[model samples]
Target: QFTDIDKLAVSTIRILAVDTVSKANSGHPGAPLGMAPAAHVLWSQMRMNPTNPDWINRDRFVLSNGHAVALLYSMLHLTGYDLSIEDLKQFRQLGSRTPGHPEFELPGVEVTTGPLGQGISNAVGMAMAQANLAATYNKPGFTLSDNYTYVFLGDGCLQEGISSEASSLAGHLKLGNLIAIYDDNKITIDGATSISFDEDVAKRYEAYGWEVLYVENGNEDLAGIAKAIAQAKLSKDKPTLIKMTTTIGYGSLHAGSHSVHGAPLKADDVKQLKSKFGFNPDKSFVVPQEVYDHYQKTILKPGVEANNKWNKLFSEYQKKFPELGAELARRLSGQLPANWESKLPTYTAKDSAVATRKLSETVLEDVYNQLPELIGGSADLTPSNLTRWKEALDFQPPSSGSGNYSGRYIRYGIREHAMGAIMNGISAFGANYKPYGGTFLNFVSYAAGAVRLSALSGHPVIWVATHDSIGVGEDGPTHQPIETLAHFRSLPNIQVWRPADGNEVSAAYKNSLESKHTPSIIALSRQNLPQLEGSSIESASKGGYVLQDVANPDIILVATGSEVSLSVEAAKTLAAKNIKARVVSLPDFFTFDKQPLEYRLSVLPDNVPIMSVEVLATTCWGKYAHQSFGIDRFGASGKAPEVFKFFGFTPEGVAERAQKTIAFYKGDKLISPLKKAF
Candidate 1:
């Protein structure tokens, strides 16, 4: 079914990758040189329209080893996405569409990738999304959401621990729509992979329940690669891994040397490589008319035709099933239900005491039915984390008997990093999937790698981080998160929402679900917190609000989570001592910073000695508070009440700190902390 033109097209893509790296005088050219053939065969088989990159049922391609971005650039340009020869020439240059790595915002790029193992992990999430949507929406006559997710990864990806976690889960979930082609060239930055990695990779994947296929001579075996992909599609019960071995830097003068891996080939080496590939040595960034014509005929035109038919099919589907169709249509338009916010529960002081973790569960139970695109799971802490809503079905294979793909709740097992990356992928799957995962607050640090990328790529994923402070009780400092809030709050483009009561929990969920970009972590308490007198959903949504205010306050107390109620109690005690004190609840740093400076200044205004109270580290409050009363060291193993008493977090303890702060600032010319000297 293939011809000599196919081979020529592969060579042309390989050359383009070479020229791109050579022009920039930077980038990893060796991997792209070796991966071009496999990439070409795969792209030719994918059902995707470059003209409409957002086609719902289109297959997704993720370059897991994104250092070899030259190859992705070459494929996008040749297969006719928005990337062009001009973009190729500006590779790795400032402000160019073709960055050194594949950014997710690019028209053709599926997910942002550079850190190894993450892209493949995201592919697992994408496969989960496709499976869930297909099961939820597909009719007998229409196979909508049948798109496959393809990934190209290398030895480095296999080495990262996150891959093992995701792969293990993918096998358990039976994600058959995922096909990962491993570029097993056996080279790394240090040298041959034998220097560090010599384990049996094929067996490892086999152990992970994947169907492993081998291409013995991946350097030139186009037919063999095509056959492998075709065979991979037949194994509908398992994800497939195609291990294709080849020489590193396939066409360079020093083909197998690590020197050719990252550095651009020498001028003489480039000329010889072009000559060897049957191109004019003097010609750079040249694509043969025959090659471009072949790609248009083979990949582009057929993809456009498929998209057109799918669009027609979807139109007819809407007529046949109006309700599901309207819901799907609304999701495609990127809107939650028009009145979904009205569903969030508001609380009053009479609502009694509840742990913020339980309040988080209340919010989920309230809103889960309202937002159909909301998908969430916990990292094996369902009972403690309280992540699942009432009657939520588990997202398991139908054969497993627990639940089916239509289920919204996922039991992510004990794999926090994998869950994090998988959530990113589900968010990127274009159905407006608002993905969240739950874990003990201390364990979220294990997934920090994926969390940072979510912020960087603006994935809008959420972490239902419970047991956020030392109130974790006898579990001790080991289970407590002393520095967790400070660490995440310091990260840019992320909301660290530590809610004080039911109203704040609802506010956190509202902001998190409504966000199109920027990730969130809602830290919830294990112990009970009393609802303040003036707390409401609208006021708490502002991220910071006054709970108790007075005219000409002698001191101000600002706190978050369980500490906010403590601050309120501290104010009551201070008032008895003839001192008027104001109480402020500052929930989310990233969201609060978005408020106008004048509003922020009004909350923590001039000539006041503001003190912040939390059981975690005190460093993060300096920008908003003049004095901090927090435990900077590790927590203790005791009953929650005893631990708070041991740490001096009582109302009198906070009132004592306020008295000291006001006394310290008595004669000083004080300015508000919000007033920065520009």
Candidate 2:
């Protein structure tokens, strides 16, 4: 069935990809050149509606080796997606949708990918969401959520440690919907794989509980590639990995070499490639109408028809199963229930002291039933993070004898990196899956690759980061998260919420769930903290609010997490010393920064020296505080009390700093940090 038109289409995709890279004078051209035939074969048979890219039941494709985005863009254009020839022409341009790396903001792109291993790891989550949804919603007469997650990865992706982390979990979950195609071209930016990566990748995946398939002549074995995918779809009990060998830059002068691995091919090389492929050497960006029609008839039309049928099927399914269908519809439209906020627990000072992590658990316990889309679990720190509800089931294969695919909780093991990436994938699955991951605050840094993309892609996932400070006690400097908040808070599109008490914990989750674009990290304390007198979810939701006010305040004390409660205590001690103080709790910098300028300035008004008190790094304090009192070095090993006292984090210690800051800025007319130069 694959004929001359198929041959022309392959060349068209190859040339379109190369020319897109060539015009930009940047990007990795070799990967696109090498993987064109396979991409052509796979995408040709894949089911996705370009007309409605966000349709819930459509097949998902994660271009894991996102540096080869040009190839992806070419495929999108040919399939009648919004990505046009003009968009391809402007590849790598600053304002264009087509960036060097594939971004989820684009029409046909599934997830933002650039960092190696993250895409395939994300695919693992995609498969998880699909399996869970199918199990939770689909019935005998209604197959509502059956879709595969296809991934195109390379040597670099497989080599990255994050890939192994997620792939291992995928195998354990028996993710039959996941099919990853590895481009086995032994070339990277450095050179041949023989010099460094010499492992049997196929054997490695097999050990991870995956079914492995191979396509020996990937460059020309179109039928073999198709057969491999068909066989993968049949392996319903395990995830599949396809190892396909091809030259680095097929049809180019630097074929089989690393020279064409990144840089664009030379002018002569492009001309020679065109001439070799039976095209006019001088003409560029050439695509036959026959090639476009071929894709339209074979892929786009079929995809659109599938979506139309699925749409009707969903309408009928909703009528048959109103409650399940209503929930699915709400999730698909990216909305939470209107009255779900009533489910969040309210707290009073009389409630007594509790670890914020435990309060976080209360929030989940109360809301998990309200929001069916809420699914998450701990990174093997279940007891500490307190991320699971009491009656929660683990999201595992039923054959594993523990849990089923419809289980709301995930046992992410020790793979923080994989958990982070997988959460993003679940979020991208477009079921409004409010997926959260739990880990010690320090270890969340291990998943930095996935965390950054979650923010960039607007995944809206939550990170249940517990053990916020040296209060982690005997865990020592190795486990203390001194710079964790500072580092993540500085990230552009993420909310780093360090909640002080029960009320603030509820506020963090409420805002985090309401958010449609931002990812969040809710840092919780390891030790118990009293619910402050003036805190409420409404006030705390403001991100930064005055917890206690003093007439003619000498200084403003701003704090977060354990420090917020500490600040309130310090304010009381300051009153005894005749040093009037105003206490402000800044729970989330990202959320607080969105408040009106007038409101922000009202909280941190001029002429008062603001002092920030947190037991973490002080780097993120400059924009909101003057003379920050936080750790500027690594943590020490001691009792939680000693660690704080040694680091001068006690109320008495904070009182001393407040006195000093009051004196330091006594005569100066200070402008609020909220006032920008512009």
Candidate 3:
């Protein structure tokens, strides 16, 4: 006979999903209905450890076809995660965790993926990170870091070009721990996938060197699905894909029809369908108790046992490998070793001039050794970006036959967006690893969406953005970043650092290492900057500091990154002309903004007309500066010095502008008469 508990559990999942979407009025309900079987199987049987959500050895499941977040909500409700029934009902509402997409940092979700193919690509990044972690920390007797990354994708995921690129890389790298279950329902939003896309997906995956398996049916084919998963696990040389043939709304009278693909079944249709399925026609969103109890006893119980067994194995593994166990625990907590910044280099005024990119290299070398958990690569710009550590190993795909996972650096080719999203994935793997990827500052725009999410999620992703400005001469306007500063400056919870000299570059590294709750973008210059005598580790960390000050100075000149030297030179010329200007090196406007208003006023002190000289967008300097002198036009193709000269960025040119700007401010009475009197 049908019982209360089984009916309650299944109906609980159904009512929760239905009621939530009914309340939101802005979500797809049919995907949840079609995929509920696979969801039930995974939640009941395959997923490991529901109690300890942050348990490191647990298998990660991502929904690449993320439209079915209501399905995820159903599982979360049954599994007793933080989201309550009321929370589910608030779906798609502002400030609710039950919003449109499943975000990684949002409660029990694994990776923040909702942009179609991105979730599966994130799965690849997670798998790669797991493999690399296992290689670096796993001992022969102890397999502490081993965990599988699984994803449920739809036709939409495969249709994305980014997924194709990511799959190629994943297959080439031989990510045997990664598995993708494609819900080959044949129908897309408008119509069948054949309308827009026509390709043999299995053959394409094979072309990419993946282990492919096909299932003829989805429902009542549990044994076949289980066997395909088993075979995927057995093959450790390449990633696996299971193409599941499923009907688009599996149980309705219109089942297998595209009409049931995106909406809820009508009341009459639901009643008839329920009667056809041998359920009471009077009840909606109801389930037989016997079915849930059977699943709980047979599926959930086994999953718990599997997790318990893994825990016991981990205990033995810890005993056999204490050091690795400790490392694993450390990574699991996401805590860096104490004083890792002690290894951060401190450049002095006496140090010779060097390109900030090379200084970044020095910082990377020290951080690489100190932070063993750091993982990253450049966007085919390693030589220019100087992102490679000394004696680094290249992370590439194994030779199609071997199962080697011994690479440190990833060659992301020229795909910047994928690199950023992948870095977010790597960082989402939690405390066991941190991700720092490289690309030119200008090209980072290509990956802006991922970076925005990184900021929003409060993940500590390091973006090594090089070729910072017009300083990257000969590359011309396309490579130059004129408005890039303003674009990122408007974002919340992101630290933008443009170091003035070598010491500031070191300071940027130090700040990034300590910051765990925010993402950082280090805009490093390709041109060599003379190490200033006034530059100190402490001053650099302050974000903006006075490089030189005159008692009762007539004017203030502020600059950041490579332009700081120019400001210093212009200040000398101003002093020679009896102007007595103060030069302040403003490396980071974001950090400076956080300082007390009193402190900011002291730095820019209401009296002086602060002239900010930087050869980029001048929008953000208005808060601290009175008048900003910057290039509003695009950069030209020429030598760096010639370009600076052409833009009238010379010491004489800067001083002339400083005089005119100061005169205007003096006439406006914004400048203190006593302060301006030199």
Structural similarity to truth (TM-score) of each candidate: 0.99, 0.99, 0.91
Q: Which ranking of candidates, highest TM-score first? A: 1, 2, 3
Of 1 and 2, which scores higher on lDDT? Answer: 1
Q: lDDT per residue, candidate 3, 183-211, as tens digits?
A: 88888888878898889899999999898
Per-model CA lDDT versus the true structure: 0.92, 0.91, 0.77
After superposition of all CA atoms, the RMSD between model 2 and the true structure is 1.1
What lDDT tens digits, residue by residue, belong to model 1 across residues 281-303?
99999999998898899889999
In order of listing, the candidates' clash counts read 0, 0, 4
Best-performing candidate as measured by lDDT: 1
Clashing pairs in 3: 6-289, 7-289, 172-397, 334-431
Please identify which of the two predictions, 2 or 3, would achieve the higher lDDT against the true structure. Answer: 2
Compare candidates 1 and 3 on lDDT and give the better one: 1
Error of 3 at 455 (Å): 1.5
Could you give me the TM-score of model 3 versus the true structure?
Answer: 0.91
